[PDB]
Amino acid sequence: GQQANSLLDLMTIRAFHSKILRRFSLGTAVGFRIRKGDLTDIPAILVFVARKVHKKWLNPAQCLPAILEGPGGVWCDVDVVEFSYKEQMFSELVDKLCGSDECIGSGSQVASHETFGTLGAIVKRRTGNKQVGFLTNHHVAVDLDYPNQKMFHPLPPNLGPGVYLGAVERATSFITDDVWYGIYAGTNPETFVRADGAFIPFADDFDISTVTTVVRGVGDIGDVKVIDLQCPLNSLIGRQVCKVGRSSGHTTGTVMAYALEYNDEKGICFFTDILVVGENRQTFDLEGDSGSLIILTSQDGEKPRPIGIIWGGTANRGRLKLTSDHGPENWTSGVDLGRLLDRLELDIIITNESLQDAVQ
Amino acid sequence: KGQQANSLLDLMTIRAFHSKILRRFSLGTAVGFRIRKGDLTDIPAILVFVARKVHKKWLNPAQCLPAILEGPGGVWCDVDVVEFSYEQMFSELVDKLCGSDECIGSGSQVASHETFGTLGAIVKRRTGNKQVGFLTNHHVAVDLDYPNQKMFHPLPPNLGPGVYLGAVERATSFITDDVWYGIYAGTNPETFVRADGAFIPFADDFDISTVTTVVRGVGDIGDVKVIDLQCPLNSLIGRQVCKVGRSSGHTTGTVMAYALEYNDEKGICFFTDILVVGENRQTFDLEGDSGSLIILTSQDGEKPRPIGIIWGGTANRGRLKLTSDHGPENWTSGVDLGRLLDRLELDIIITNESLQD
Amino acid sequence: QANSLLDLMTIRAFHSKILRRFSLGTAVGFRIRKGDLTDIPAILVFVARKVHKKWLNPAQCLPAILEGPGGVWCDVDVVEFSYQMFSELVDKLCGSDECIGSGSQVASHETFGTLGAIVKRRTGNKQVGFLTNHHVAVDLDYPNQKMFHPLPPNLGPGVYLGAVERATSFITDDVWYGIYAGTNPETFVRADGAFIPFADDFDISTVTTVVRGVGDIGDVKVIDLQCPLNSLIGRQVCKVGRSSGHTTGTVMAYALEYNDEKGICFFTDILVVGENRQTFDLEGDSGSLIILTSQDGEKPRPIGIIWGGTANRGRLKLTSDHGPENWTSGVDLGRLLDRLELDIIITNESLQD
């Protein structure tokens, strides 16, 4: 008879009641109840519909209950959100990240022969030789069917001047929920979590001595921050995050929901990790920022800690409307950094001391 | 040496008397107040809508319209040359008129299986059953490619949640000028005015107890104000009007011309009744506002009076230049409420105690 | 065993729930086996694709026998639905003639069409005219159009025929058929029809009653819903159209029921397919008269009017070593006549008087 106070409890409650909510919803996530336009502190399951019609034009069989109970007597609220399923910045930071700098690092532009992207972090393989490289999104890194994919910065040789970074070695795709979350967050045989990743070691002839580990526009970042499923709920949802992109530069935002699910028509259930909406009714990211690091804003004057990377373009998928008298605002979807570094056995490099010593 | 134009009727027949030279090089013609230097004056005139207003140095005398016309009994009036061509709001009212409220009324969103529209008002038929329904335009109501077209609010069941309102009962199509105005306004055997409208009865099992007469943004409206065609010209032209729409919310405007006539290539001459332009170069209605009530803004502190409804959502039909320091601004066309209340015989409900009878 | 149409629609109405699960439509006719029609009454089930009964779930295998009230049984057939001629007749039906008649080209300001038969209202003034399809006759937002032959004055030389007076919209099956053919509150039997009176100043002396290319037709033939099944299904039909000219065909099925994703049930009356793997009407023959081929030295009798515009649309795909064939939909010209209360002037004596 207790109230949910962690992400695991809400995820288990949604798993118990997966069939009721999905009947008239375009998606479902777990977070904080949104009332009168801003987050409250009451845990709730956020269900996503296409329109919020007053419950006077709804038959009784379409009015979702506001309270659900799960295993062991855990209850939580139900909140209904109105979901929906090119302004490039010009500044001194975008120019440097697009290749007008003397060094490469996080937020820099990485390109293939066909698509652009954004450099993520500078990572390290935890096993074997422990080569040095970087990690990004495979939708900009791996072309489905050319046999080899090479990395160039800023542009490929067939499009402009650039240098050859490396080749894709390991790439990730949708994985089962059991390995990712550790629980059965659903009643479907085929539930996959989309977490793109790509480890590209630097070439043996590369000039790696002109790379940096500090984030341009954020300063110095700390060690990676893992997301625990049984921690207080106000530790992930409702916090302040930032991003450095090649197209939009430094942008700020906040975390709105966790564990977004889509349920395509063919029957496969796809989970999306994080939901980020920009601040001051701005956009958190453009299209082309896929790969940029997502870092929590420093609190009580500590070192900011990356918590994930941007999946890609969410404008095509749609936007969301927070209860207000203003127009809808788009969102941004992320991926957990911890279980994307564990699945690839990668280590975050924050300073040059761990870079110089491990380049041997 | 005679009398000057001083009203709408019998000085609009002056255009009928001279409908031979007016439309040779013009896209249309209306009657109202002369516009000079961008402001509306008080001299009655006949506005001539051309697609390009050049200075009188590059015109042969053939296409130079005179500034004075004559009619029956020695009546004269001026001639005006006007340049004339032929994304919803996000606020709280817009949200309340699309299903976020607990009541329905004028300005509410009414939808069919294909189109979108706005609720006109709450009405009663003056004979027979006397059931309380509502009225709108038919470009949203009727379809002749379906036997039944039903109304849902906010959305049809095949597009989203909603409630069933009713079906179309009466919708008079384009109607001739003789019964509408009374005068033979034109020398064309086939002259029609597009008085689109549709009376839609409420469902038998529809909850009446959740509908209202409040305009939701104008306050309380009075009895319908008929456009009497024997009053001075300063009774319709130049007054302030307003509307409530599902897309554009609540806006305001002014009346510039009356009885705008349009002739197509096939030969049929079509009259449009009311010309409205926005204030401060703002728009008066978006696309999807067709069927919204047009209400005169009340002066001297009386109750506002509805005088018409919006014909169609304008984005393609209308652009006119008033001043030579700003770009063209679109206009909105309306239909008289009071002769559309006669061919669709009705009675407007203005209080909440006329809903319980 | 059913031996008529009346008890053939009744079984489908009784079993209109299991059939609609995996079908694009349903009609009543004769069983088709190996590409030819048999003499066994059956119910045609129009699926999107034919597969062998081994890649199908047990609930997706439609039974071959259904029963209805009164202990009457019928077979079930599964069909695979897939929902200008240059001659001297096409020229004479397009404006080169010295007279107007059946099969002539009639045009509105927007669309083209085809004249049907010369008709006469049975009450009131009894003034002559003609009847055709309203998707040519009526422009909806302008009810009473003017009729011109061959072309409107804004498109070419022509003469003014008249203006539409009465037009037929969707009709419910209660008045049309008589039986409640369907357990659906909204079942519509949308028979196109439009009587266009001739103008008072029309010459009328240049109007014929013989069908160009068929000769002299007899009186109209009504379709009785309870008769021997080989009286309508399996017969030979023909037409005279403005676009394709004379063309022969064969009636395939009766009372076709197509569906739309709105919940409202519709009905189509007559199914016709071409002969020798040809097309029955290409485009613009909407309104052409459907006439049974003369049998045993008789006079051909009109039995329907083409709905039209179903060549670049519906294909009657067969699973017997060939490409899809085109089907044409028609409407019974006995009830289109009755509910508009008209006649059929078959000879010159009834036109003059």
Ligand SMILES: Nc1ncnc2c1ncn2[C@@H]1O[C@H](COP(=O)(O)OP(=O)(O)OP(=O)(O)O)[C@@H](O)[C@H]1O
């Ligand atoms: N399937 C549905 N589609 C559209 N609207 C619905 C549906 N189900 C419920 N609603 C409406 O959603 C309303 C509640 O949204 P919500 O759950 O957030 O309440 P809230 O947070 O208290 O209020 P607020 O709207 O102020 O954010 C319900 O009370 C009902 O009016």
Ligand SMILES: Nc1ncnc2c1ncn2[C@@H]1O[C@H](COP(=O)(O)OP(=O)(O)OP(=O)(O)O)[C@@H](O)[C@H]1O
């Ligand atoms: N067919 C035409 N096309 C373009 N311009 C025309 C045409 N006919 C007349 N004009 C010119 O329009 C000008 C007159 O406009 P108007 O009729 O408004 O007078 P006005 O009200 O005194 O001036 P304004 O409104 O511009 O201050 C004259 O130069 C007139 O010749």
Ligand SMILES: Nc1ncnc2c1ncn2[C@@H]1O[C@H](COP(=O)(O)OP(=O)(O)OP(=O)(O)O)[C@@H](O)[C@H]1O
């Ligand atoms: N829903 C369906 N979709 C596709 N195919 C089906 C379906 N149901 C049945 N079938 C196949 O259709 C076959 C029969 O078609 P039909 O009913 O006409 O038999 P038939 O006339 O004896 O043979 P023929 O195919 O020679 O015309 C079934 O026996 C089965 O093989």
